[PDB]
Amino acid sequence: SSQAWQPGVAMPNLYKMQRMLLEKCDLQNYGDSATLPKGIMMNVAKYTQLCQYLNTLTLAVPYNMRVIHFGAGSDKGVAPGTAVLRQWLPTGTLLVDSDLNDFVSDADSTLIGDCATVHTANKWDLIISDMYDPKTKNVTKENDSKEGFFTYICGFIQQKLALGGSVAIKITEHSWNADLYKLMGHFAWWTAFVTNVNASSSEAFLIGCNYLGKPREQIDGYVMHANYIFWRNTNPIQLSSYSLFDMSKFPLKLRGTAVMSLKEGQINDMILSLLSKGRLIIRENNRVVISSDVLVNN
């Protein structure tokens, strides 16, 4: 494991091509723990490693980039992941976050409520989600595709992700959704990324890199989640904090990626290829407006 100096490990392509049956996740290093730098929270370390890995992909990075972060609160009422995202993203990037429970944040705007209440007028260049419901960790019931916030996330990607944009959505052994895996085939590239600091967990970030707005490949999400678990079950990942100690190249590169408005009819193969290379964002460039629906009763 020269993997130990990486920020984490991405699911190798050959595992994506299998047709495994779903098994229980049994991680060799379950209950091992990385030694974090003095005073650093797991959530800061985890998001730092996610961003270090995203630095290796062909992300579109326009001027006035727009990023939205779901599940950004903590039981301590602060937003460590948002703080890392704001560190990583170019100065001036508009960052919105949200959580079911109240918290204070460094984001430009924060919405409190169930994610299903969140609406935005504009499209986004990057969607991050850490949402997770610990009730799903029921080892005594069958492990089926979950709905809940995953239904919202799938619709939100299809309706409010700019072509060319990317996503990183947290999943676990039991917190997953088949349509979300299916949606990964609507990106130019996808993976399941495991942070080295949290490699003792079945957590991963499902990353869709450069959205194309149509199926590039047909993915059966029940099969692919089984493939993911098979990978994790047969490839122990050594816990590691090494990458946290070198932050000299951390900030996301300002690429000034072009932003254009185009109607579905003008998305030709040449456009699709620019999207695939991280060289184009398709959306409007109007004001960013958001809201949370409030249910009124007695």
Binding site: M41, V78, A79, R86, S105, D106, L244
Partner: protein, 115 residues
């Protein structure tokens, strides 16, 4: 005329021997930065830690109004550099200290202007 004075209350709570506010969000960084007090990205030097600003603001953390007419917060959305010797209580530090309006450093913890 009545106003809650949270700054005073926290100072008094600390002198009473109270445990400082915890869970301020400490960032990973190079620790080769400018050392200025409040910055758009982490700027800790070798003698400092950098923290997410909102998490180090007494008013943000206590869910109370900020003490100025339009309720603006100087820390939220920024990073605050705290001397490592004081990083056990970032909120107390930011409350009790002042930023030199010329050099951007903390008075008494980096400001050279009065030499």
């Amino acid at each position: 005329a009545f106003a809650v004075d949270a700054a005073k209350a926290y100072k008094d709570y600390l002198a009473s021997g109270g445990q400082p506010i915890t869970n301020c969000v400490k960032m990973l960084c190079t620790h080769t930065g400018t050392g200025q007090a409040i910055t758009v990205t982490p700027e800790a030097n070798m003698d400092q830690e950098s923290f997410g600003g909102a998490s180090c603001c007494l008013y943000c953390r206590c869910h109370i109004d900020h003490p100025n007419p339009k309720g603006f917060c100087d820390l939220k959305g920024k990073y605050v550099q705290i001397p490592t010797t004081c990083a056990n209580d970032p909120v107390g530090f930011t409350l009790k200290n002042t930023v030199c309006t010329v050099c951007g450093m903390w008075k008494g913890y980096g400001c050279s202007c009065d030499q």
